[PDB]
Design a protein around this ligand. Structure first.
Ligand code: FAD
Ligand code: NA
Ligand code: NA
Length: 423
């Protein structure tokens, strides 16, 4: 419903921004500009170099159901060519164990997982749609454990938790079911269970670097946007080097932060102020005693264990002097934030306990991760409001908050945005 001569400003050159550009271009919208704050593209798909190979400070993997990412690879020529993923399970004291062989718990999990699968296919059909503009069943608005409890499927959490909480998405005691099941829909959960997982030799960042290259208008980098105002039916953007006018604004950046440099209206302030995010910290480590496999720590995914390492990534199996990244969470609604100080010490103390002591941390990042809203705010209609606001003063809303904090979900949402409002 937008004219092709519309000047479109895309904020953010992560997967969501780059995809917005790709799919606008492909629909015949050629006057777009992507504005990126940093000197690089890919956002949280971030793959730096060390000793001739790239490691992952962010996203690592996908599943075969990453249809939109497949479309992106078709465009760039990239292939799923990374090292195969495999894992073991550790207790908080470093003891290796196999949860699948628990005689009492094992059959409980498998019963719940099967019952849930059947409920998802029928009672909750539609749960798995990208975005939240299609209003989900009320049960899905509850925290994941409450959702499970209502259906007698509590034991399902043992399977679902490992690719969720450890991957920094937070805890089932509070994170609403709708987020969990849009990412870990039954097919995706199964793909994780089987280990049918994509990785990239040159990192997840590589294909978005290449996507950028294939664009008619690659991202403008190092753009320090100080002001956006939206009067007279136009979008005026002010940076450090220039101020310029566009017709349409497309946001793939943190929307609560956008409040601080925009003429945000009453609804934007009110609703974007409700956004909560995860403080997810990655440390890239040189280790003595190199693992021979990646490790998960369900024990350390309990809220009572916030700040502890929940998982570590074994990437290059052939070189014991390569990077092993560790993952912990710094926040939870029921607790005060953990300091970077105390969490870094837990990285040292946890890895030594696991038998993989750290010689060096060469890089650390706490990421702005998984923007979402509370079960109450979800129930109160958050996305009915925000999706209802779409196109208001030529501003459109996208990125992680409108879908989910994964790179297929955001790209798929960007694709559909063009379908929903532009064509
Ligand atoms: C440790 C880790 C593990 C992950 N694991 C997976 C996984 O297994 N599978 C998966 O699918 N995803 C995974 N992800 C999530 C995935 O990387 C993100 O969901 C994805 O990058 C989202 O893309 P986005 O563009 O929507 O936001 P982002 O990736 O955060 O990119 C946003 C962009 O906007 C820019 N920006 C922000 N503010 C401004 C400003 N005001 N002005 C201009 N530009 C701005 C940023 O610099 C950035 O480039 C992981 C991420 C991390 C950190
Ligand atoms: Na299992
Ligand atoms: Na999905």
């Amino acid at each position: 419903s937008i004219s092709k001569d519309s000047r479109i400003a895309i904020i953010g050159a992560g997967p969501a921004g780059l995809a917005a550009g790709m799919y606008l271009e492909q629909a015949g919208f050629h006057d777009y500009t992507i504005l990126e704050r940093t000197d690089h593209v890919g956002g949280k798909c971030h793959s730096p170099n060390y000793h001739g190979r790239r490691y992952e400070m962010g996203a690592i993997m996908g599943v075969p159901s990453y249809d939109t990412i497949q479309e992106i690879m078709d465009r760039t020529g990239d292939k799923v060519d990374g090292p195969k993923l495999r894992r073991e399970f550790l207790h908080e004291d470093g003891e290796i164990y196999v949860p699948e062989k628990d005689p009492v718990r094992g059959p409980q999990v498998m019963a719940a997982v099967q019952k849930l699968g059947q409920l998802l296919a029928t009672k909750y059909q539609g749960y798995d749609a990208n975005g939240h503009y299609n209003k989900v069943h009320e049960d899905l608005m509850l925290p994941f454990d409450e959702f499970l409890a209502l259906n007698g499927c509590e034991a399902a959490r043992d399977l679902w938790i490992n690719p969720f909480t450890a991957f920094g998405y937070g805890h089932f005691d509070n994170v609403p079911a709708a987020y969990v099941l849009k990412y870990l829909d039954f097919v995706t959960m199964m793909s994780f269970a089987k280990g049918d997982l994509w990785t990239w030799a040159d990192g997840t960042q590589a294909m978005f670097e290449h996507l950028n290259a294939t664009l008619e208008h690659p991202a403008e980098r190092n753009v320090d946007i100080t002001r956006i105002t939206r009067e007279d039916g136009k979008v005026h953007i002010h940076t450090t080097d220039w101020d310029r006018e566009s017709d349409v604004l497309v946001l793939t950046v943190p929307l609560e932060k956008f409040l601080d440099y925009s003429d945000a209206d009453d609804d934007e302030r009110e609703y974007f102020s409700k956004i909560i995010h995860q403080q997810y910290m990655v440390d890239a480590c040189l280790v003595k005693e190199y693992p021979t496999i990646s490790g998960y720590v369900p024990d350390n995914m309990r809220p009572e264990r916030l700040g502890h390492v929940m998982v570590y990534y074994h990437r290059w199996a052939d070189d014991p002097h390569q990077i092993i990244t560790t993952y912990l969470l710094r926040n939870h609604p029921d607790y005060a934030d953990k300091t970077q100080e105390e969490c870094r010490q837990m990285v040292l103390d946890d890895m030594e306990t696991f038998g993989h002591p750290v010689e060096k941390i060469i890089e650390e990042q706490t990421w702005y991760y998984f923007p979402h809203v509370s079960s109450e705010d979800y129930k109160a209609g958050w996305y009915e409001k925000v999706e209802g606001m779409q196109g208001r003063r030529n501003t459109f809303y996208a990125g992680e908050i409108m879908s989910f904090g994964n790179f297929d979900e955001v790209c798929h949402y960007s694709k559909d945005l063009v379908t929903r409002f532009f064509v």
